[PDB]
Amino acid sequence: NLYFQGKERRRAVLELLQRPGNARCADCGAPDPDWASYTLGVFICLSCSGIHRNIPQVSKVKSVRLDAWEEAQVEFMASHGNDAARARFESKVPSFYYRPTPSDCQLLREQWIRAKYERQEFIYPEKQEPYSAGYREGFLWKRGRDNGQFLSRKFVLTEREGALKYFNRNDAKEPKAVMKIEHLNATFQPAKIGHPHGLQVTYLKDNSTRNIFIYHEDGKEIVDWFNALRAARFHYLQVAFPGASDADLVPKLSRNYLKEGYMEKTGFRKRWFTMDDRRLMYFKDPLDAFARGEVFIGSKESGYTVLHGFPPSTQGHHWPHGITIVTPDRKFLFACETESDQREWVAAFQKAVDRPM
Ligand SMILES: [Zn+2]
């Protein structure tokens, strides 16, 4: 009964999706993947399948449900799969190495797939040296301090000195800037930086917060920089926090910002705000080289409250939608342009409020 034959082959491959090990995209972790690399033997989301197609000499994809399958292809998935791929392709992933989520930028999702399956960095660990050696140097494009032009500059990350440094566009032996690892936070910001490989590096200098904005033409190179920076952070935290587990530390290597955007602050004046964990920073503009100031936001239990609207007898022209933050010592007033802005900011603030000290 050929109908039964066809049906059985179809339900065989579907049943593989219905294995717990295959319940999430192999690459980004999105639930319920619908596609497959029948050459890598993994189940993946639509988005990751699109990336896989761009490495055709490595990965060939089909829809699990909507494409025709050969017995041997189904058999290959059955002998392989996502657990198998974890053991094979993620065998030697360093603890510091950033693993992308579905909301990450394309660069990170793409480079993850390439690192695992193309370059096979976690099968052959000598390939990990760019981000594992505690020393890395190379050229990067850096946004001008006070202008929008990028200049190519030599950067050096040196664990021995606990710093990232760059140099002038000259022969000089002494760096232009030294950025200490202890308070360095690197996040990818392609939208903001206006380059798909745009990396923001934010650090503490002379008890003030500073930003640089850099990129490399090559996706691999920038992502190597990023992971090198994480390595340095990790090795730092390990020293700083004896007895802390890997899991304790890894979430601290770098931190995406809870929320960023324009708000008005007390007259009222528009500033670009950035919520970094418990630290609400502001700037004149997103590409400002320095923080103009900062507000700390502790726990509800520590006397912090987030309230909607403005207090009675608030005066001025402002944006319509107010937020008040009550601290044990002070009051902070903000005005948001829109309600969704307000809702968004309220929630970010509340995240800090709701989290114990
Ligand atoms: Zn995916």
- The secondary structure of 300-353 as a DSSP string is GGGT-EEEESPPSS--S---SEEEEEE-SS-EEEEEESSHHHHHHHHHHHHHHH
Q: What is the CATH number of the domain that holds 303?
A: 2.30.29.30
Query: What are the tokens at 46?
Result: 């639509």
Residue 261 φ/ψ region, left for φ over 0, alpha for ψ in the -120 to 50 degree band, beta for the rest: left
Q: What sign does the dihedral 81-86-90-91 (CA atoms) show?
A: negative
What is the CA(203)–ligand 1 centre distance, in A?
Answer: 32
What is the CA(186)–ligand 1 centre distance, in A?
Answer: 23
What is the CA(234)–ligand 1 centre distance, in A?
Answer: 27
Using alpha carbons only, give the angle 79, 86, 75 rounded to the nearest 5 degrees: 15
What is the CA(92)–ligand 1 centre distance, in A?
Answer: 21
What is the CA(270)–ligand 1 centre distance, in A?
Answer: 38
User: Residue 338: is it exposed, middle or buried by C-beta count within 10 angstroms (0-12/13-18/19+)?
Assistant: exposed
Residues 5 and 108 in one domain: yes
What is the CA(229)–ligand 1 centre distance, in A?
Answer: 25
What is the CA(34)–ligand 1 centre distance, in A?
Answer: 10
3-state SS assignment for residue 221? helix
What is the CA(43)–ligand 1 centre distance, in A?
Answer: 9
Residues 245 and 317 in one domain: no
Q: Where does a domain end: 103, 133, 163? A: 133
C-alpha torsion 11→12→16→19, nearest 10: 80
Residues 100 and 197 in one domain: no
Question: Is the Cβ–Cβ distance between 215 and 199 less than 8 Å?
Answer: yes
Q: Which residues of 167-205 are buried (b: 16+ CB within 10 A; e: fewer)?
A: beeeeeeebebbbebeebbbbbbbeebebebbbbbbbee
Question: Is the Cβ–Cβ distance between 133 and 124 less than 8 Å?
Answer: no
What is the CA(104)–ligand 1 centre distance, in A?
Answer: 11
**Among 101, 104, 15, which residue's Cα sits nearest to residue 65?**
15
Residues 285 and 328 in one domain: yes
Residues 301 and 183 in one domain: no
Quick one: resolution in A?
Answer: 1.9
User: Residue 127: is it exposed, middle or buried by C-beta count within 10 angstroms (0-12/13-18/19+)?
Assistant: middle
What is the CA(149)–ligand 1 centre distance, in A?
Answer: 35
What is the CA(70)–ligand 1 centre distance, in A?
Answer: 24
What is the CA(22)–ligand 1 centre distance, in A?
Answer: 12
Residues 270 and 250 in one domain: no
What is the CA(91)–ligand 1 centre distance, in A?
Answer: 19
Residues 297 and 323 in one domain: yes
User: DSSP string covering 18-55, please?
Assistant: TSGGGSB-TTT--BS--EEETTTTEEE-HHHHHHHTT-
What is the CA(84)–ligand 1 centre distance, in A?
Answer: 17
Query: What are the tokens at 52?
Result: 């896989």
Residues 139 and 58 in one domain: no
Residues 243 and 263 in one domain: no
Which residue do the tokens 């937020």 mark?
323
**Domain range for residue 14?**
1-133
Number of domains in the chain: 3
Residues 81 and 129 in one domain: yes
**Among 300, 115, 91, which residue's Cα sits nearest to residue 220?**
115
Q: How many CB atoms lie within 10 A of CB 264?
A: 20
Solved by what technique?
X-ray
**How many residues would you count in the chain?**
357
What is the CA(325)–ligand 1 centre distance, in A?
Answer: 39
Residues 103 and 179 in one domain: no
Question: Is the Cβ–Cβ distance between 186 and 201 less than 8 Å?
Answer: yes
What is the CA(214)–ligand 1 centre distance, in A?
Answer: 27
What is the CA(27)–ligand 1 centre distance, in A?
Answer: 5
What is the CA(300)–ligand 1 centre distance, in A?
Answer: 37
Query: Which amino acid belongs to residue 112?
Result: W
97 DSSP assignment: S
What is the CA(126)–ligand 1 centre distance, in A?
Answer: 27
Residues 283 and 231 in one domain: no
3-state SS assignment for residue 94? coil
The two most distant CA atoms of the chain are separated, in Å, by: 82
Query: CA–CA separation, 213 vs 202, rounded Å?
Result: 9
Query: CA–CA separation, 166 vs 78, rounded Å?
Result: 50
Radius of gyration (C-alpha) of the chain in whole angstroms: 24
What is the CA(260)–ligand 1 centre distance, in A?
Answer: 26
User: What residues pair up with 269 in beta bridges, in sequence order?
Assistant: 265
Question: Is the Cβ–Cβ distance between 264 and 271 less than 8 Å?
Answer: yes
Q: Where does a domain end: 133, 165, 189? A: 133
Q: Where does a domain end: 233, 257, 281? A: 257
Query: What are the tokens at 326?
Result: 């009550």
Q: What is the CATH number of the domain that holds 84?
A: 1.10.220.150
